[model samples]
Target: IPPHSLEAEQSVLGSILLDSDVMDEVEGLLPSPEAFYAEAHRKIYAAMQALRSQGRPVDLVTLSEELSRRGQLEEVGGTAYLLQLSEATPTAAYAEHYARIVAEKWTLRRLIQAAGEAMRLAYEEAGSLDEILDTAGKKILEVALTKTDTEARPMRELVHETFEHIEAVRTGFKELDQLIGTLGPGSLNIIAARPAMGKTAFALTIAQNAALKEGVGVGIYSLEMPAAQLTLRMMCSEARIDMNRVRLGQLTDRDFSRLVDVASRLSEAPIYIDDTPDLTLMEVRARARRLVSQNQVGLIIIDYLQLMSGPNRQQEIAAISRGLKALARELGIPIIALSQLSRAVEARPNKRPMLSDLRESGSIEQDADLVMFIYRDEYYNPHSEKAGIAEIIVGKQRNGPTGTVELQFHASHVRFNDL
Candidate 1:
């Protein structure tokens, strides 16, 4: 609750006014004008930013004029306070240090605000205990994330840093990899399919490849299925054993051997699963934050987005979609959210999913960085020429070309293999 540092705030503003070049040093360090503890300091800093943005000098004269034009000059103690701030700092050399202090105090104030809100909610019993806890966690995490480095670099700097650096997280499907490259960090990818079309299995396959093959931690939030069932599906796919047979205890000696081998291999894989049913968007994000922090998970998968609860269907789904996208970027990991395609696909003679077929298509499509649809012609025509072929149609990709990639879908094992 002890948030203010009037001395630190004045020093930051004074440093900026004294030497305009110091603005660059503290530009990204202080998140916003609100970071200033004093109202006059906030106004002065905001005006300085405005002048700088317009390619104007950020000294005392320009700052005062900008504040005056906005009618905030007298409110900020007129030109006298501005001159006082400039005289307060001998040099701008300590601008970065002052800015950090301001940022630290702002973060502390936010934490206090969040704590107060949490207590209010708890006292009122406004939500379930789980929901209340999740809300509180999210508020605190949001404040913590304000400290993350998110400054935009020049194109040349970005290219130099990323040119040889690997960007994609491969999912181990050759054709899919070629089509979509690798799932990029801070990307929201959607895998949509109709019922029984192996969307969950497809996502689980990616999770397995990411955690096992790539030797990176993976987190799966299964809203539709239990963690045990999802694990069984993964075991069947990994060991090439039959899911029903395993479920029915009809495994032969070899099946048992393969199962044991797959289990042992998978035991070493850093795959975590949470099958918490009826999870709200905030709850899921809170859990994902913990996973990323505790396990350093590189990828996250949410089984079927529609199962997520919101206050209203359309608005809630939209918020959830946006939240997932934000979560991916905030955690700097690729998120693969399984979505259920509406029956509109079935109404089409082609039976292929279009971007418009996504349930609550507006925000889901808009928020997603990549949208992939699963289409199996054999599902509609058992004797068709494309039997056993699952076409992964890249309906939307923000940064790359869109196309279709074919894979072999084994129904018995609930697995998708590279074609």
Candidate 2:
């Protein structure tokens, strides 16, 4: 099937030439110069844009002059074609409509090209299937996002609007709130720690509080654990019941009652969980987008970043990190990605995780707007004075000061509480 319309392209260019004011109206609708099917039309459109940019009026004479000055007059069919374009369109009132048609045709053509390229790449076994698929997905996504406008807004109006904006979702910790503002929309926050340092528990607790206590939708992507296990942990935390007791079927009547109460309350929470193992970055983004649309999820959590799959170790992690950041921005929600610290943290004397301690430190640190580490001294020293206390170390805060907030970590229930 034909994917482009030469008539629509000609009409759009003609409308612009008929009335230069229509250029501004259609400028946001045109994808690019190549949006025109005919090479001559593309050249004519480019010349019109060049004249518009220089504050020169765009008409048959001016457009032709601009093309001639650029030595493209003969290449674009000379002044005869320019006069025909001006005469083709009666008025500029429908310029945006015509431009939209051209844009639609261009998008269709782009999709066709991307599909052909994808087929060619699929037939070639030169690269890993994951990388090939990722590239293909990106090609289509780029075309899909071509319609977005990149207009700059005045800071004065922007500042005023921001001042009137509502407060961002809270992380449910008072001291943490005092130290750093609530996790705002479009923020990529990282939580990292060594094994058994309570990073998962910390993220789940935030998800629970945000969904249940605050009546906001939250999505959890448990890459490392299954949904059942994650739910059990959440139940134990909510009921303040020991996880071991529940696992061993040693629940007392009181524990059962508490479980019933907690389950009833949690069942109503707007918390969505996906425990897909070895999930690719695209899968995560697609699932998260659906959650945002269907459940209006305000926050997202990915458990343990290292568990995510990519073509290779480094590139995969890099894609995952950037994808999470982009997902947060696109959905306009806060995303908390749990990460593992490098063994270098364990070998250090302090044993507290720094920004550099993030497993895939380069991309994670660079992409995240906020980077935090979980540090519990009791993990290393059972009899330490800071036993039962966990430090939420704010190692990197792009918008605020860096510091630490203390919370009590109850291992039996796998729960963290404000201290």
Candidate 3:
């Protein structure tokens, strides 16, 4: 009686259908509609004739409409009275059971006679083409269910093969990669922290490592900084140039040479950057798909999730998280999204970010395969003896052990490595 038992019902429908001489004659010769018809009714009508020839009841229209529209009148026949009747009639509401009842006992002639009566009543009450179609579709399919033979084995194999062959595999990022494994296909990995805790810097280092050194394709979508500004940041980090000098274009001859060399080397690296502001989720997914197919992108890095589309400040975080998660799954690639933690984290005596520090942390944690919290001791206690170490706390790992990966946070070079 479950709605999902289409295969079982098909067998019963088929037995009844085969018993009818008219249906068996035309059973194999029905004209299908064009591939891209907008309406399901067109397709259902062709099917109705095939069932009717089999001498089956073709009174499926109302029930079909109800099922398709979830009892929403506007979406189906736009007949409020029809919806009300369906709800009130236990027989009508239990379409699946009603179908079984007719399929098991009623002959083709009896079913046709009953369907004619039902259609007449429905037409009198709701004289709409959509309503007529909806009622007819339900009756035919309800009886057709008994005669259909659906093999679920092929579908099961398809699902199994899909996961086995196309599932996301991890790339080697040393310890982090080893611990978490490659961000499996369509996975959203979020790294969050308070401002000045080095979210962008950390992400850039990861990108540099993945794209330039590890030979993994990476796209950095930055909403906050302009392309030129981010390039300068990369230059400063890679060339060990002072941030102040780079910002002011105060490079000496030697510094300029280093910048040139750095640029040339990085040009050969497969790192693409887009600094488009106010980009919607759909646009990003399209661009990313092209990159993956044409450029063989292995990973996608969003500069920060919080900066993504949101109508208001209150909704921004949740909207961003949902969009990023969906993007990851759609692309079948891992997404590394940066996020800014709440001010509450900074206000606390211990400035380290926990999973709770994330803005709209619940959904991020729910959607993401992994959540890493970045904490720089140098920022909170710069004068302390442990000046270089940055703690990457793996607060939640859907795949592996939750722990920390410590890397030396090199500010001048904008790089990170094992301490």
Tens digit of per-residue lDDT, candidate 1, span 96-178? 99888888888888788778887887898877877788777766666765453336543433453466374647879987787
**TM-score of each model, in listed order:** 0.70, 0.71, 0.59
Best by lDDT: 1
Give residue 106's error in model 1 in angstroms. 0.8
- Report, for every candidate in turn, its global Cα lDDT versus the true structure: 0.81, 0.80, 0.61
The per-residue C-alpha lDDT of model 3 at residue 264 equals 88
After superposition on all C-alphas, the RMSD of every candidate to the true structure, in Å, is 5.8, 5.9, 16.1
Clashing pairs in 2: none
Order of quality (lDDT): 1, 2, 3
- Model 3 Cα shift for residue 102 (angstroms): 40
Clash totals for all models, in order? 0, 0, 35
lDDT of 1 at 383: 87
Residue range 91-116, candidate 2, lDDT tens digits: 88999998989988878887888788
lDDT of 1 at 8: 89
TM-score of model 3 relative to the true fold? 0.59
